[PDB]
Design an enzyme around this catalytic site. Structure first.
Site, mmCIF file in Angstrom:
data_model
loop_
_atom_site.group_PDB
_atom_site.id
_atom_site.type_symbol
_atom_site.label_atom_id
_atom_site.label_comp_id
_atom_site.label_asym_id
_atom_site.label_seq_id
_atom_site.Cartn_x
_atom_site.Cartn_y
_atom_site.Cartn_z
ATOM 1 N N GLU A 1 0.845 -1.209 0.000
ATOM 2 C CA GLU A 1 0.000 0.000 0.000
ATOM 3 C C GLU A 1 0.880 1.259 0.000
ATOM 4 O O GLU A 1 0.551 2.214 -0.722
ATOM 5 C CB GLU A 1 -0.908 -0.055 1.229
ATOM 6 C CG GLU A 1 -2.047 -1.058 1.132
ATOM 7 C CD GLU A 1 -3.013 -0.829 -0.026
ATOM 8 O OE1 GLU A 1 -2.888 0.186 -0.716
ATOM 9 O OE2 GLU A 1 -3.847 -1.705 -0.269
ATOM 10 N N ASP B 1 -15.575 -4.707 8.941
ATOM 11 C CA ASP B 1 -16.826 -4.254 8.263
ATOM 12 C C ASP B 1 -17.435 -5.345 7.361
ATOM 13 O O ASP B 1 -18.487 -5.066 6.771
ATOM 14 C CB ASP B 1 -16.619 -2.964 7.461
ATOM 15 C CG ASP B 1 -15.825 -3.123 6.179
ATOM 16 O OD1 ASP B 1 -15.307 -2.103 5.690
ATOM 17 O OD2 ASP B 1 -15.727 -4.269 5.669
ATOM 18 N N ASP C 1 -6.377 8.141 -0.886
ATOM 19 C CA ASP C 1 -5.878 7.148 0.105
ATOM 20 C C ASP C 1 -4.711 7.758 0.882
ATOM 21 O O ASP C 1 -3.791 8.356 0.242
ATOM 22 C CB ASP C 1 -5.416 5.867 -0.585
ATOM 23 C CG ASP C 1 -6.512 5.070 -1.270
ATOM 24 O OD1 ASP C 1 -7.714 5.367 -1.032
ATOM 25 O OD2 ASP C 1 -6.147 4.099 -1.986
ATOM 26 N N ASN D 1 -7.495 8.607 -6.051
ATOM 27 C CA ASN D 1 -8.343 7.606 -6.748
ATOM 28 C C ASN D 1 -9.040 8.297 -7.923
ATOM 29 O O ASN D 1 -9.255 9.511 -7.868
ATOM 30 C CB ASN D 1 -9.307 6.934 -5.763
ATOM 31 C CG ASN D 1 -8.576 6.260 -4.609
ATOM 32 O OD1 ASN D 1 -9.005 6.330 -3.439
ATOM 33 N ND2 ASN D 1 -7.427 5.665 -4.921
ATOM 34 N N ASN E 1 -9.054 5.252 2.627
ATOM 35 C CA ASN E 1 -9.730 6.027 1.561
ATOM 36 C C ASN E 1 -10.647 7.053 2.223
ATOM 37 O O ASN E 1 -11.350 6.667 3.178
ATOM 38 C CB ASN E 1 -10.482 5.053 0.658
ATOM 39 C CG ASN E 1 -10.926 5.654 -0.650
ATOM 40 O OD1 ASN E 1 -10.909 6.870 -0.791
ATOM 41 N ND2 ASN E 1 -11.299 4.809 -1.616
ATOM 42 N N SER F 1 -11.633 10.498 -4.610
ATOM 43 C CA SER F 1 -11.274 10.223 -3.196
ATOM 44 C C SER F 1 -9.738 10.166 -3.168
ATOM 45 O O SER F 1 -9.122 10.091 -4.245
ATOM 46 C CB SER F 1 -11.891 8.960 -2.642
ATOM 47 O OG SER F 1 -11.458 7.825 -3.377
ATOM 48 N N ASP G 1 -12.030 8.272 -8.675
ATOM 49 C CA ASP G 1 -13.358 8.750 -8.222
ATOM 50 C C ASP G 1 -13.198 10.088 -7.498
ATOM 51 O O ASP G 1 -14.225 10.601 -7.119
ATOM 52 C CB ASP G 1 -14.096 7.705 -7.383
ATOM 53 C CG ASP G 1 -13.570 7.478 -5.980
ATOM 54 O OD1 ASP G 1 -12.485 8.009 -5.632
ATOM 55 O OD2 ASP G 1 -14.246 6.786 -5.236
#
Ligand code: NA
Length: 129
Positions: free
Chosen positions: A35, A101, A52, A46, A59, A50, A48
């Site tokens: 990562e 989650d 990280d 990202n 995120n 967003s 989209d």
């Protein structure tokens, strides 16, 4: 901060990540390696819009507030900047909520693609833990 492999393994263990939700410490070190390359200051945009943040590339879409991710949540109740600290407490606490989650460490696509099913113990080999 750029951690050493065994230094990060020690920090994650101190913060209760070792076997958290059944994921051995090697899994967490492997995920951090791919990562962030163990760099707490790592950031990646990202497609989209967003972003990280940090050793585990958490995120802004769901987990932290960066003020520039429309329609996003802040489920870890933290500024994304806290995920860039030399102190890994905020990244660890927030990673515990993510891995709880429902999809476990599959939430980390680099974990699924590069760590899952591999000899992850190699990542803590030789470390004084
Ligand atoms: Na957010």
């Amino acid at each position: 901060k750029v951690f050493g492999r065994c230094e990060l393994a020690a920090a994650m263990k101190r913060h209760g990540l070792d076997n958290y939700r059944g994921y051995s410490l090697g899994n967490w070190v492997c995920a951090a390696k791919f990562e962030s390359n163990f760099n707490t200051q790592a950031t990646n945009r990202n497609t989209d819009g967003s972003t990280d943040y940090g050793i585990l590339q958490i995120n802004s879409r769901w987990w932290c507030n960066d003020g520039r991710t429309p329609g996003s949540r802040n489920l870890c109740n933290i500024p994304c900047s806290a995920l860039l600290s030399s102190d890994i407490t905020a990244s660890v606490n927030c990673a515990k909520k993510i891995v709880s989650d429902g999809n476990g460490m599959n939430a980390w696509v680099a974990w699924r693609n590069r760590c899952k099913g591999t000899d992850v113990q190699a990542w803590i080999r030789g470390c004084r833990l």
